[PDB]
Design a binder for this molecule. Structure first.
Ligand SMILES: [Cl-]
Ligand SMILES: [Cl-]
Length: 162
């Protein structure tokens, strides 16, 4: 297990444009295209991302490519965030993955609502963190996924994903 497989599991793989749990146009391995309600807008963003006239459909390779880039950017976002980076550096490898997962899912944004959890994580108060993290819209909206991530942070193992 690693971040890529983990996320592949949590996000799935779809080769045609679809709506995510929030209703946003997405493709591939959770690659958000746009929050706009316009399918055309989405198609435009897709073509721009891929470099060709896709007509809303992509290949597996293409999907994987967006994915790699997306992971990369998430990490890079983390390393560039002053609130995040210190936490991340303090963690072990498994838990780092849990944290990348979350940013991939929701972005850097929202980091403020997660202040308390951060602090807990930085201190290595796993069970307390786990509880605090569950007090969130995130958990209430995507509970199964959130449980997996929270478990990961709590245990430092991949058991939730096995
Ligand atoms: Cl892109
Ligand atoms: Cl879920």
């Amino acid at each position: 297990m690693n971040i890529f497989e983990m996320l592949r599991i949590d996000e799935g793989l779809r080769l045609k444009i679809y709506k995510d749990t929030e209703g946003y146009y997405t493709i591939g391995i959770g690659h958000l295209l746009t929050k706009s309600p316009s399918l055309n807008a989405a198609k435009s963003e897709l073509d721009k991302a891929i470099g060709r006239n896709t007509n809303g459909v992509i290949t597996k390779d293409e999907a994987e490519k967006l994915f790699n880039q997306d992971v990369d950017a998430a990490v890079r976002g983390i390393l560039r965030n002053a609130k995040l980076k210190p936490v991340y550096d303090s963690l072990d490898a498994v838990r780092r993955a849990a944290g990348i997962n979350m940013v991939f899912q929701m972005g850097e944004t929202g980091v403020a609502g997660f202040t308390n959890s951060l602090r807990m994580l930085q201190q290595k108060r796993w069970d307390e963190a786990a509880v605090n993290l569950a007090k969130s819209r995130w958990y209430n909206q995507t509970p199964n996924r959130a449980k997996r991530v929270i478990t990961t942070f709590r245990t430092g193992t991949w058991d939730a994903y096995k």
